[PDB]
């Protein structure tokens, strides 16, 4: 017989699809890591050596996109001992995360952009999709090529820039160095076909989002490029966060923080405030920070609580972790399960507990446990 | 019905397939820009929406990989007027080029790596496969990030560094600066999963390859990384290149030079010298000088016609040999898994159709896909 | 009663003490992480709150000093996937390592000295003794402060510089750059009270130690500062290392290499060659490659078992020899004043308990003190 | 048709021999250094010589070093 295994044909059939839009019992045919067909009842013989897997009674949805993860590690705020380790592949996949954006935090003395980049590429070769934000809390930005505009333009995996404001660990930037910073990420993004976004690490200062509004006053970076994070870290900052989203911005809630505004409660209050889910993202702030290193569970736990204790549909709870993120970061072929897109799907149960995970066509999670891991796990 | 056109299924059937190694009348199933099947006589209905194409009586081989092109332009060796223009996509796809390695030449004052990088990425978006070499004739090299090792390492499209020796347009580099440069390209390559080569532009100096030998003494960079080009520019130098190839090194012959050693005459003499074709590649140095890419296909033709090379062996220096030197995974060879970079030729080797990563570039010998502003 | 536990008094009694020089059944009184007494049969009540521990029938020797560890990680010589993880505290303390010298290898693009410095300091807070070498295979060296001399001089944990020669992953360094580098490490060391050594990663080049000899001609850096490593990587080179050791220089053998010259086979041949063990140390190159530290204790064991070295002489290359080469005051030797870095072994040399600066690291052969995130 | 060299104690050891191989084409299998075990570095070099194809000659009449 002729050999067609190169195509890596796979037929996910029988599941109740959520792409994330509620579909019904639909099927998904994969070929070469890409979704090439989405329709109910696809013939199992339609293509050669097709690995047909029956997901009858299962839920099929898009893989998670985590845009706030300390891939190479973080912490260090309480001494060099508090420097956390690098994130393990399996730790992500088992959490549903198929796409991830890495950034740096407080420490940019013992943590470097070239280290984040290399790692970002390790994960890519290992099967998932990884990107990174140049810079860190400190402003001006310590970068790779010498300028933020240049990094976001010429370093492929860089899609924007990070920074901290209204935090006692800030670098104390002025509206000038902050506006210039956001402008370079914008321009560079245009030149390199990247989102060119600016992600602000929100602290607890009373000024809250003030630095941002000042920036909008001092330049012409669209409000759709600024992304405040950890918005649910204190009530008045979350209140302001809602007002921000109202004027067109997209806010980012972190699941790793439970008080004084829980993740689920945050996404819920947003809807109640009339913000389209499209402008609401949920990130994990994974591997940063007993002293304890943050994990990626709270993500799925948000989707669950959203469907179980708030009335969000499965389709809606998925958005802030799928379609919303890919949309804000213009992640082509991601967050959506439609023909053409990548095969980043998760197999779950109707109780929303992950069973299988597919990244670009490969099986990362076979039974809720990773069958694929980092080279030294 | 259900929609499967997302997979862009295409079946090239009934052609005399050379991959380059002469197979028979083989069929090639393509899906998502990938060759997913190669076995004679494949069903025209094996896969759903399959664009089936009848290539009966035609030749099918891998597209050419040209590793010496001044993508953003070159020249300038006689004033700013002599600065050649950038390369047009259709120009490449029509000469049967599906993968190319850009680089800079003498002028590295009005030509910068950031621009080349940009042009390389623009080409990849448009349909073909492009990479680039950092630096220029100048040593030490004007890089993007500060060091050659860093460029090759972290700039995704840099596969090695370029430079110029035994030429009257060099920077008069000394063995140490030279050695260090290559070592950085080599180390960088390992860190970036790049071949980490060092391409040497050869001039007409009596010294010829002496600097490349001098380098071997002062460092440990494998000889499989040192690639001299334009070896066919003068006979005394060509002779040495052959001796260099006999030692395990690879040599690059430029199809844009027709004397004293013509391209074909070059690839030919190597075989006679007893050099596995594996260590011989053919580059165009297109858009240099204004050089064109016609001479690549012409060197194949003439090799099969004027000289007595076979279609398969003639193709090698322009495919598999090149692919194996830069470690361009998935190219220069037609097998399941590799990229659907294909060329449909007549029995007389006259490119009719061209495929790049699945997409159809040349329809009637004339590109049907072009750059944004042609 | 009054509280004296602040002194953390501990008495290790009735063990066969090797410091490393074979003493008899000696007792060791520890106070505030310091060995304050060494004389057979000490009172279990000599000092107030004294944690008395019965080591009858057990061996007691100094903890190992491993001077070749990629603390923050290494590798990367085959893409970013091959970048090894950082070293775990328990991994070290379980292999009997109480003092370690971190360093960087081939990758000095995604690995920086600031991180190593940070990891070194984190280790010291956690219980063990750590130092680091600045630079990497690359020459000139990528430093923290701008110059090797300044790093060794003012960065408190830098004791010298590292680099790589006669290897295919070097930066192709020339005698001048090399000499200057060592001279800066030497001068720096004097200004900082550091050994100011220069550790050379040895490759598989025919040249072998020739660069280290070439250096001796062009400068005056004492030969007691030039330390080549991995000398047991190829026999031709090992032979030279021995000749180098016969001239007053010290040689480092890596326990992570088992052929053509195994570790034990290495330490053994040196003795036969008539080299005082003083000029021979054993390193692991742990977390390199992913390398581990088991081979350190295994090289001791095998030395006492397979070969005919005594427990005392076997320990030297892993303690006193190392301590005397880096001038690590208060380590590698059990005497009053020195640090309470101890290893409780069985008669068959199987680490049972481990002590680092007084604190107990390994209880039942398994660390009971770990890094913050293990 | 062999050549037998009486090795002395000069530091140059086998140097004269290697120079010879450089200055003519007598096979290395025809040169025979003797008393190779008369001093350690000459014996060391003797081993390297044998490695490149030569045959060394040790003399029983000498016991040290």
Contact B329/A at CB under 8 A? no
Any idea which residue has 């839009």 for tokens?
A21
3-state secondary structure of A96: coil
Closest Cα partner for C101 from C339, C332, C311, C266?
C332
Residues C230 and C312 in one domain: yes
Rounded Cα–Cα distance for residues C164 and C169 (Å)? 8
Any idea which residue has 């690059």 for tokens?
B252
Tabulate helix, strand, coil % of chain B (nearest 5).
30, 25, 45
Rg (CA), chain C: 20
Rounded Cα–Cα distance for residues A8 and B236 (Å)? 52
Q: How many domains does chain A have?
A: 2
Contact D47/C at CB under 8 A? yes
Rounded Cα–Cα distance for residues C100 and C89 (Å)? 11
Find the helix or strand (DSSP H, E) in which A325 lies: helix A323-328
Q: Taking CB atoms and an 8 Å limit, are A2 and B42 in contact across chains?
A: yes
D1: distance to nearest CA of chain C, Å?
A: 30
Tabulate helix, strand, coil % of chain D (nearest 5).
40, 15, 45
Best probe of the C interface among B175, B181, B191, B223, by most C CBs < 10 A, is B191
Q: Which residues of A touch B48 (CB under 8 A)?
A: 37, 46-47
Q: How does strand B50-54 pair with strand B9-18? A: parallel
Rounded Cα–Cα distance for residues B73 and B84 (Å)? 5
3-state secondary structure of C326: helix
B6: distance to nearest CA of chain A, Å?
A: 5
After which residues is the backbone of chain A broken at C–N > 2.5 Å? 289
Size of interface A-C (CB pairs under 8 A): 70
Rounded Cα–Cα distance for residues B154 and B189 (Å)? 9
Residues C23 and C134 in one domain: no
Q: Starting at the earlier edge strand, list the strands of the sheet with C97-102.
A: C64-69, C97-102, C129-134, C158-165, C197-202, C226-229
B162 is in an annotated binding site: yes
Contact A85/C at CB under 8 A? yes
Rounded Cα–Cα distance for residues B245 and B231 (Å)? 11
Residues, chain C, total? 374
Q: Do chains C and D touch (3 or more CB pairs under 8 A)?
A: yes
Q: Taking CB atoms and an 8 Å limit, are C125 and A376 in contact across chains?
A: no
Q: Which residues of A touch B193 (CB under 8 A)?
A: 125
Question: Are A276 and A248 contacting, i.e. CB atoms less than 8 angstroms apart?
Answer: no
Q: Do chains D and A touch (3 or more CB pairs under 8 A)?
A: no
Six-digit token string for C337: 């004043």
Question: Are C185 and C196 contacting, i.e. CB atoms less than 8 angstroms apart?
Answer: yes
Q: Taking CB atoms and an 8 Å limit, are B48 and A47 in contact across chains?
A: yes
Rounded Cα–Cα distance for residues C256 and C260 (Å)? 12
Residues C54 and C111 in one domain: no
Dihedral angle, C-alpha C252, C254, C260, C265, nearest 10 °: 70
B217 is in an annotated binding site: no
Rounded Cα–Cα distance for residues C105 and C162 (Å)? 9
Any idea which residue has 């004269």 for tokens?
D16
Contact A142/C at CB under 8 A? no
Residues B243 and B171 in one domain: yes
Q: How does strand B129-134 pair with strand B158-165? A: parallel
Rounded Cα–Cα distance for residues B142 and B110 (Å)? 12
Find the domain containing B297 and state its range: 64-328
Q: How does strand A64-69 pair with strand A59-62? A: unpaired
Rounded Cα–Cα distance for residues A234 and A241 (Å)? 10
Q: Which residues of C touch D48 (CB under 8 A)?
A: 236, 239
Residues C34 and C160 in one domain: no
Which phi and psi angles does D57 have, rounded to 5°?
-125, 115
Q: Taking CB atoms and an 8 Å limit, are A6 and B34 in contact across chains?
A: yes
Find the helix or strand (DSSP H, E) in which D45 lies: helix D40-51
Residues C59 and C151 in one domain: no
Rounded Cα–Cα distance for residues A29 and B32 (Å)? 13
Partner A, chain C 233-292, Cβ-Cβ below 8 Å = 290
Any idea which residue has 């002062």 for tokens?
B218
DSSP C72-116: T--B-BTBGGGB--PPPHHHHHHTTEEEEEE---S--SS--HHHH
Contacts of A208 (CB under 8 A, 6+ apart): A166, A202, A236, A237, A240
Contact C206/D at CB under 8 A? no
End-to-end CA distance of chain A: 39
Rounded Cα–Cα distance for residues A7 and B358 (Å)? 13
**Helical H runs in A164-292?**
175-192, 210-217, 235-246, 263-272
Question: Between D40-51 and C235-246, two packed helices, what is the crossing angle to 10 degrees?
Answer: 170
Six-digit token string for A220: 């012409």
Torsion-angle region of residue A65: left (phi > 0), alpha (psi -120 to 50) or beta? beta
Contact B176/C at CB under 8 A? yes
Q: Taking CB atoms and an 8 Å limit, are C80 and B176 in contact across chains?
A: no
Residues B81 and B192 in one domain: yes
Rounded Cα–Cα distance for residues B58 and B26 (Å)? 11
A290 is in an annotated binding site: no
D51 is in an annotated binding site: no
As separate numbers, helices (DSSP H) first and strands (DSSP E) second, chain C gives 10, 16
Q: How does strand C22-31 pair with strand C34-38? A: antiparallel
Rounded Cα–Cα distance for residues C6 and C267 (Å)? 42
End-to-end CA distance of chain B: 39
Question: Are C75 and C288 contacting, i.e. CB atoms less than 8 angstroms apart?
Answer: yes
Six-digit token string for B134: 């950092």
Rg (CA), chain B: 20
C107 is an active site residue: no
Question: Are C31 and C8 contacting, i.e. CB atoms less than 8 angstroms apart?
Answer: yes
| Partners of chain A (3+ Cβ pairs below 8 A) | B, C
Q: Which residues of B touch C80 (CB under 8 A)?
A: 191, 193
Six-digit token string for C9: 């008094």
Question: Are C232 and C271 contacting, i.e. CB atoms less than 8 angstroms apart?
Answer: no
Kindly provide the b/e burial profile for residues B356-372, where b requires at least 16 CB atoms within 10 angstroms of the residue's own CB: bbbbbbbeeeebebbbe
Which phi and psi angles does A172 have, rounded to 5°?
60, 50
Nearest chain C alpha carbon to D47: C239
User: What's A57's domain CATH number?
Assistant: 2.30.40.10
Residues B9 and B105 in one domain: no
Q: Taking CB atoms and an 8 Å limit, are B7 and A117 in contact across chains?
A: no
Find the helix or strand (DSSP H, E) in which B62 lies: strand B59-62
After which residues is the backbone of chain C broken at C–N > 2.5 Å? 289
Closest Cα partner for A172 from A143, A145, A205?
A205
Question: Are A265 and A238 contacting, i.e. CB atoms less than 8 angstroms apart?
Answer: no
Question: Are B363 and B353 contacting, i.e. CB atoms less than 8 angstroms apart?
Answer: yes
User: What's B242's domain CATH number?
Assistant: 3.20.20.140
Please name every residue paired with B161 in a beta bridge, in sequence order, or none if there are none.
B134, B198
Kindly provide the b/e burial profile for residues C158-168, where b requires at least 16 CB atoms within 10 angstroms of the residue's own CB: bbbbbbbbbbb
Comparing CB atoms, the residue among A85, A114, A376 nearest residue C110 is: A114
Rounded Cα–Cα distance for residues C13 and C41 (Å)? 7
Q: How far is CA C5 from the centre of its chain?
A: 32
Please name every residue paired with A202 in a beta bridge, in sequence order, or none if there are none.
A165
Contact C308/A at CB under 8 A? no
Give the Å distances, CA to CA, from C66 to A159, B38, C145, C237, C242. 42, 55, 26, 22, 21
Question: Are C182 and C219 contacting, i.e. CB atoms less than 8 angstroms apart?
Answer: yes
- C147 burial level (CB within 10 Å; 0-12, 13-18, 19+): middle
Comparing CB atoms, the residue among C85, C115, C372 nearest residue A110 is: C115
Nearest chain D alpha carbon to C273: D40
Q: Which residues of A touch C373 (CB under 8 A)?
A: 84-85, 291, 293
As separate numbers, helices (DSSP H) first and strands (DSSP E) second, chain D gives 2, 2
Q: How many CB atoms lie within 10 A of CB C146?
A: 8
Q: Do chains C and A touch (3 or more CB pairs under 8 A)?
A: yes
Question: Are A31 and B31 contacting, i.e. CB atoms less than 8 angstroms apart?
Answer: yes
Question: Are C226 and C212 contacting, i.e. CB atoms less than 8 angstroms apart?
Answer: yes
Q: Which of B66, B107, B151, B285 is catalytic?
A: B285
Six-digit token string for C312: 């005392």
Six-digit token string for C184: 């800066």
Q: Which residues of C touch B154 (CB under 8 A)?
A: 109
Any idea which residue has 């056109």 for tokens?
B5
Contacts of C154 (CB under 8 A, 6+ apart): C145, C191, C192
Best probe of the C interface among D40, D42, D49, by most C CBs < 10 A, is D40
* Side-chain-side CA neighbours of residue C255 (13 Å): 28
Closest Cα partner for A186 from A212, A220, A210?
A220
**∠ Cα B159 B164 B168 (to 5°):** 165
Six-digit token string for C51: 């944690």
- A309 burial level (CB within 10 Å; 0-12, 13-18, 19+): exposed
DSSP letter at A45 equals: T
Any idea which residue has 């040290």 for tokens?
D64
Rounded Cα–Cα distance for residues C102 and A23 (Å)? 56
Torsion-angle region of residue D27: left (phi > 0), alpha (psi -120 to 50) or beta? beta
Give the Å distances, CA to CA, from C319 to A99, A253, B12, C194, C349. 48, 53, 70, 18, 15
Contact D48/C at CB under 8 A? yes
3-state secondary structure of C359: strand
Six-digit token string for B158: 């840099």
Q: Which residues of B touch A6 (CB under 8 A)?
A: 34-37, 336-337
Rounded Cα–Cα distance for residues C255 and C252 (Å)? 10
| Beta strands per DSSP E along chain A | 10-13, 16-18, 22-25, 27-31, 34-39, 51-54, 59-62, 64-69, 97-102, 129-134, 158-165, 197-202, 226-229, 251-254, 280-283, 345-348, 354-359, 362-365
Residues A34 and A85 in one domain: no
Rounded Cα–Cα distance for residues C242 and C248 (Å)? 10
Which phi and psi angles does A52 have, rounded to 5°?
-85, 125
Rounded Cα–Cα distance for residues A165 and A203 (Å)? 6
Closest Cα partner for C170 from B160, B159, B226, B149?
B149
Going by the annotation, the residues of the binding site of C for substrate are 75-77, 106, 137, 169, 233, 289
Q: How far is CA B359 from the centre of its chain?
A: 20
C29: distance to nearest CA of chain D, Å?
A: 46
Peptide bond before residue B341 is cis, with ω within 30 degrees of 0: no
B339: distance to nearest CA of chain A, Å?
A: 11
Question: Are B96 and B64 contacting, i.e. CB atoms less than 8 angstroms apart?
Answer: yes
DSSP letter at A106 equals: S
Question: Are A178 and A216 contacting, i.e. CB atoms less than 8 angstroms apart?
Answer: no
**∠ Cα A352 A355 A360 (to 5°):** 110
Contact D58/C at CB under 8 A? no
CA torsion sign, B4 to B6 to B12 to B18? negative
Comparing CB atoms, the residue among B191, B218, B220 nearest residue C203 is: B220
Question: Are C327 and C64 contacting, i.e. CB atoms less than 8 angstroms apart?
Answer: no
**∠ Cα B2 B5 B11 (to 5°):** 120
Best probe of the A interface among B1, B3, B7, by most A CBs < 10 A, is B7
- D3 burial level (CB within 10 Å; 0-12, 13-18, 19+): exposed
Find the helix or strand (DSSP H, E) in which C238 lies: helix C235-246
Largest distance between two CA atoms of chain D: 35
Give the Å distances, CA to CA, from B228 to A103, B164, B200, B279, B343. 42, 9, 5, 12, 28
Closest Cα partner for A228 from A261, A254, A206?
A254
After which residues is the backbone of chain B broken at C–N > 2.5 Å? 289
Question: Are A227 and A191 contacting, i.e. CB atoms less than 8 angstroms apart?
Answer: no
3-state secondary structure of C342: strand
Closest Cα partner for B233 from B279, B280, B290, B167?
B167
Which phi and psi angles does A328 have, rounded to 5°?
-70, -35
Please name every residue paired with A66 in a beta bridge, in sequence order, or none if there are none.
A100
Any idea which residue has 């390398």 for tokens?
C291
Find the helix or strand (DSSP H, E) in which A324 lies: helix A323-328
Kindly provide the b/e burial profile for residues A136-159, where b requires at least 16 CB atoms within 10 angstroms of the residue's own CB: bbbbebbbbbebbbbbbbbbbbbb
Residues A85 and A223 in one domain: yes
Comparing CB atoms, the residue among C109, C168, C173 nearest residue B221 is: C168
Residues B155 and B140 in one domain: yes
Rg (CA), chain A: 20
Q: Which residues of D touch C274 (CB under 8 A)?
A: 40
Residues A181 and A255 in one domain: yes
């Amino acid at each position: 017989m002729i050999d067609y295994t190169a195509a890596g044909f796979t037929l996910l059939q029988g599941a109740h699809l959520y792409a994330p839009e509620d579909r019904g019992i639909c099927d998904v045919l994969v070929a070469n890591g890409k979704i090439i067909a989405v329709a109910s009842n696809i013939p199992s013989d339609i293509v050669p050596n097709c690995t047909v897997v029956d997901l009858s009674g299962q839920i099929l949805c898009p893989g998670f996109i985590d845009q706030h993860v300390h891939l190479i590690g973080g912490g260090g705020e309480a001494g060099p001992t508090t420097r956390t380790p690098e994130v393990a592949l399996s730790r992500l996949t088992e959490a549903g995360v198929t796409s991830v954006v890495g950034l740096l935090g407080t420490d940019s003395i013992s943590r470097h952009p070239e280290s984040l980049l290399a790692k970002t590429r390790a994960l890519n070769e290992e099967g998932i999709s990884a990107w990174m934000l140049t810079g860190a809390y400190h402003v001006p930005s310590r970068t790779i090529t010498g300028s933020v505009e240049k990094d976001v333009a010429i370093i492929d995996r860089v899609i924007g820039v990070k920074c901290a404001i209204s935090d006692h660990r800030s670098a104390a930037p002025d509206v000038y160095h902050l506006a210039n910073m956001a402008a370079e990420s914008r321009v560079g993004g245009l030149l390199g076909g990247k989102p060119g976004v600016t992600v602000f690490h929100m602290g607890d200062s009373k000024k809250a989002l003030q630095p941002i509004y000042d920036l909008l006053e001092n330049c012409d970076v669209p409000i759709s490029k600024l992304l405040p994070t950890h918005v649910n870290r204190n009530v008045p900052l979350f209140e302001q966060a809602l007002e921000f989203a109202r004027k067109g911005g997209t806010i980012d809630i972190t699941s790793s923080i439970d008080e004084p505004v829980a993740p689920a409660e945050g996404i819920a209050r947003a809807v109640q405030a009339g913000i389209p889910l499209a402008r609401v993202t949920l990130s994990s702030d994974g591997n940063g920070s007993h002293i304890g290193v943050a994990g990626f569970e709270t993500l799925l736990e948000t989707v669950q609580v959203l469907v179980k204790d708030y009335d969000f549909s499965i389709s809606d709870a998925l958005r802030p972790l799928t379609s919303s993120v890919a949309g804000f970061l213009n992640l082509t072929g991601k967050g959506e399960i439609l023909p053409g897109n990548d095969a980043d799907l998760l197999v779950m149960t109707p109780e929303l507990r992950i069973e299988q995970v597919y990244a670009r066509g490969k099986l990362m999670v076979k039974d809720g446990k990773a069958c694929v891991k980092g080279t030294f796990e």
